[PDB]
């Protein structure tokens, strides 16, 4: 009958293969992603801590330079960059970690749930490497971490952390060590 | 805003350029208060309302009015302007 | 599938309506206004979804059912009761005479005998009622810009003007003139 293009067929066959093979339990744990409510409440806090864009960083530099021609505290932003975040994990400087579920060399993020478990930092596998990049003004972002928040919202971060260790990491507990797929 | 003609020279019109024929001037028919010779019969008005639009030689027939406050605004004013707009940009003109 | 959050937002937003309405009925049906009489133009404002019965009947009394339409109203003791009851769904303030001038000329529509037909002629204004000193368009403005002994009758002829939707844009002293300016 009709003929399908080559890259079209390969996209679908890889999706079938990655979900139906005997997947080892470090890739199978990436199939379990947090709920829609928890993701929305996570991005409610994280959008309040968005990094400054190139347009408004330049504006602030022009503000401070102008005042010199004619007093602040440490900036609290959202931490990104895989090499940066892993170091923040290893020094126990992070409080909540979000991991994209679609990193296409998946080896960049396989150790990352277990590394956060070893040091005790609450993590949550999230849908969208594109969604995290939007949060941090890039096309993509494999991992997103929060380290310290301002005093006006220490309570809702600790509430969000408790909603991860109760709503996400408790359900994952006896199903992150099991092989995925089958048949 | 800058002035236009810092350097102006006449340009000969090409024979291909066919300008739009201008609209006819407002004649004696278009007035609000025509002479009684121009006043039509009420039967002619009733027949004219009976026929469908775009089936008449004249889209308007006169009617005698007394005062300015009795004179109404035309219903198809924007329709006439839009039909003109389609006339000079969607209907070609034979030279 | 209505989410649970929407349910909780409703109840907290209905209890605040119950609290404020009790505070209005507690003190009095009066507003801190000087004794000089003025005129208020009120415009429907998109607001709280579920309407309690008492603000709902006041919209009905002010013929404010459909959104974004607006009517004229003077100040009485009784009017300030309706002003502060329906306040979260309306915008109010004293307009200007030229603001009325567009509202009768450019924004003017007609209401006679229970059916809503547009304004047709000055003699049609005579045909509508045309009697209580009503001879032209400025009759309505005279009853509006100046306080009218038959302004209640002038409102009786009047219909709520369906104002125009703007695109991307407490009593206002004269800032309501900016309201129609984007909404004309």
């Amino acid at each position: 009958m009709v003929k399908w293009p080559e890259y079209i067929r390969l996209q679908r066959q890889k999706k079938i293969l990655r979900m139906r093979l005997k997947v080892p339990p470090a890739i199978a744990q990436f199939q379990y992603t947090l709920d829609k409510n928890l993701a929305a409440q996570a991005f409610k806090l994280l959008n309040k801590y968005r990094p400054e864009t190139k347009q408004e960083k330049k504006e602030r530099l022009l503000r401070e330079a102008t005042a010199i021609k004619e007093v602040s505290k440490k900036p609290y932003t959202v931490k990104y960059g895989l090499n940066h975040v892993v170091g923040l994990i290893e020094n126990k400087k992070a409080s909540l970690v979000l991991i994209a579920n679609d990193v296409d060399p998946i080896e960049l993020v396989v150790f990352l749930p277990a590394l956060c478990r070893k040091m005790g930092i609450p993590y949550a596998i999230i849908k969208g490497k594109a969604r995290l990049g939007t949060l941090v003004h890039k096309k993509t972002a494999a991992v997103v971490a929060i380290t310290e928040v301002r005093s006006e919202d220490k309570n809702e971060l600790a509430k969000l952390i408790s909603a991860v260790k109760e709503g996400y990491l408790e359900k994952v507990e006896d199903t992150r060590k099991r092989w995925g797929g089958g048949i | 805003f800058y002035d236009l003609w810092q350097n102006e020279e006449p340009q000969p019109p090409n024979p291909m350029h066919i300008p739009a024929p201008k609209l006819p001037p407002p004649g004696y028919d278009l007035s609000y208060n025509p002479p009684p010779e121009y006043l039509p019969t009420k039967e002619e008005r009733e027949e004219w309302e009976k026929m469908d639009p775009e089936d008449r030689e004249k889209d308007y027939l006169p009617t005698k009015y007394d005062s300015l406050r009795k004179v109404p605004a035309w219903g198809n004013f924007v329709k006439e302007r839009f039909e003109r707009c389609m006339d000079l940009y969607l209907a070609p003109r034979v030279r | 599938f209505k989410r649970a959050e929407k349910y909780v937002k409703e109840y907290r937003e209905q209890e605040r309506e119950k609290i404020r309405l009790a505070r209005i009925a507690k003190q009095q049906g009066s507003f801190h206004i000087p004794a000089e009489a003025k005129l208020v133009f009120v415009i429907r404002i998109k607001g709280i979804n579920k309407i309690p019965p008492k603000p709902r009947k006041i919209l009905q009394l002010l013929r404010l059912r459909q959104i974004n339409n607006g009517v004229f109203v003077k100040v009485t003791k009784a009017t300030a009761e309706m002003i502060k009851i329906v306040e979260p769904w309306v915008a109010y303030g004293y307009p200007n005479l030229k603001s009325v001038r567009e509202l009768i000329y450019k924004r003017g529509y007609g209401k006679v005998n229970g059916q809503r037909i547009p304004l047709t002629d000055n003699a049609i204004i005579e045909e509508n009622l045309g009697k209580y000193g009503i001879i032209c368009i400025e009759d309505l403005i005279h009853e509006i810009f100046t306080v009218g002994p038959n302004f209640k009758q002038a409102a009786n002829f009047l219909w709520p003007f369906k104002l125009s939707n703007p695109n991307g844009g407490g009593n206002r002293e004269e800032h309501i003139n900016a309201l129609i300016r984007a909404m004309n």
Binding site: - | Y28, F77, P92 | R107, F145, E174, R181
Partner: protein
């Protein structure tokens, strides 16, 4: 000793259809039409429509090749591509989510709904379109009469109220020039509205102003097309009245007061400072306009012929001569109704209209109110 093809050469080169024109221009079907009113490109007809294109119909429209070549060599085509991505970038910060970046892109958009100034620069387009200042007055026949119609019109999505408020500003600016230089000579009225005739530098200009009444736009009409001719005649009259205002030497733009205009002054809200037969008619006269009488045409006619003092009602407007009818300074009071001061003579607006047409002071006894009006004559 060689041959060619009949359909390939000749009349196919000189005239091409509208479908072939929009394909060569590589624009969308609507985007051709705004550009085609801008450069004044007209379809016309060849002598033989079958010879130009064998598969053709009389309903189809052809176009000039050099006019399309002129359309290809316009800077607006580059401005169309830059602006098209700009609305693509206004869906950028709206999509991913950035309120500040969506703002700073839309101040950079400079959209006409909040400015009144147009979206595109029409300076070079009118540079190539109209050749001389006399044709500006010839095009002022069409330029004024829609803007007096548009200023009375309400607002739609295509024409913002700020565009009309700039139309009402610009229509008032041409009126203030006319009442200073007294260039208005002839006036006619009919069912359509009020026609004014004024001569500027020997050029007669005719425009039609309908009455102060909301007009039904019922039917199939295009506001997107109509909003462009607003932008057309905004810039043209803005260019025309700029040239003539330095010609009379008064400082431009005229100064305006906001809130005193908001009180309903209409014509009388603005101050003019002269440094940065018409006059003899009502050279020393006193006028009052009553509640029924049309305030805008009567004041425009009186000030155009040098009437020094015109008063009217406090609900018709403000910032004028004293409203009180008991004040005996008034000579003639305009009344159209179905005190009785002997000092003031009681008349109609028709007496003004016929005494300004004949310029011979038509008798108020033959034009006394309560009596049948004698039939008037068209000045044309």
């Amino acid at each position: 000793g060689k041959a060619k093809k009949k359909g390939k050469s000749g009349a196919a080169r000189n005239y091409m259809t509208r479908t072939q024109a929009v394909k060569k221009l590589q624009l969308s079907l609507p985007d051709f039409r705004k550009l085609c009113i801008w450069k004044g490109i007209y379809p016309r007809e060849p002598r033989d429509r079958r010879k130009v294109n064998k598969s053709a119909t009389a309903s189809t429209t052809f176009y000039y090749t050099k006019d399309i070549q002129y359309l290809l060599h316009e800077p607006l085509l580059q401005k169309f591509r830059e602006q098209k991505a700009l609305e693509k970038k206004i869906s950028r910060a709206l999509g991913r989510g950035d309120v500040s970046n969506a703002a700073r892109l839309e101040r950079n958009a400079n959209l006409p709904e909040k400015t009144g100034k147009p979206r595109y620069t029409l300076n070079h387009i009118i540079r190539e379109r109209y050749p001389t200042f006399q044709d500006a007055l010839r095009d002022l026949d069409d330029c004024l009469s829609m803007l007096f119609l548009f200023a009375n019109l309400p607002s739609t999505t295509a024409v913002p109220a700020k565009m009309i408020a700039r139309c009402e500003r610009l229509c008032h600016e041409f009126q203030h020039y006319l009442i200073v230089t007294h260039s208005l000579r002839k006036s006619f009225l009919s069912i359509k509205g009020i026609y004014y005739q004024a001569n500027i530098q020997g050029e007669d200009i005719l425009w039609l102003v309908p009455y102060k009444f909301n007009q039904r736009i019922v039917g199939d009409v295009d506001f997107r097309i109509m909003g462009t001719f607003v932008e057309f005649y905004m810039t043209l009259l803005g260019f025309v009245n700029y040239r003539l205002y330095t010609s009379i030497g008064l400082k431009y733009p005229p100064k305006f007061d906001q809130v005193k205009d908001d009180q309903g002054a209409e014509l009388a809200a603005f101050s003019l400072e002269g440094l940065n037969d018409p006059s003899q008619l009502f050279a020393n006269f006193t006028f009052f306009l009553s509640r029924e009488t049309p305030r805008q045409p009567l004041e425009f006619i009186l000030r155009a012929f040098g009437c020094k003092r015109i008063g009217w009602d406090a609900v018709l407007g403000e910032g004028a001569f004293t409203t009180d009818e008991s004040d005996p300074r008034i000579t003639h009071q305009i009344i159209d109704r179905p005190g009785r001061y002997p000092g003031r003579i009681y008349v109609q607006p028709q007496w003004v209209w016929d005494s300004i047409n004949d310029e011979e002071l038509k008798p108020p006894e033959l034009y006394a109110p309560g009596a049948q009006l004698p039939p008037h004559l068209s000045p044309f």
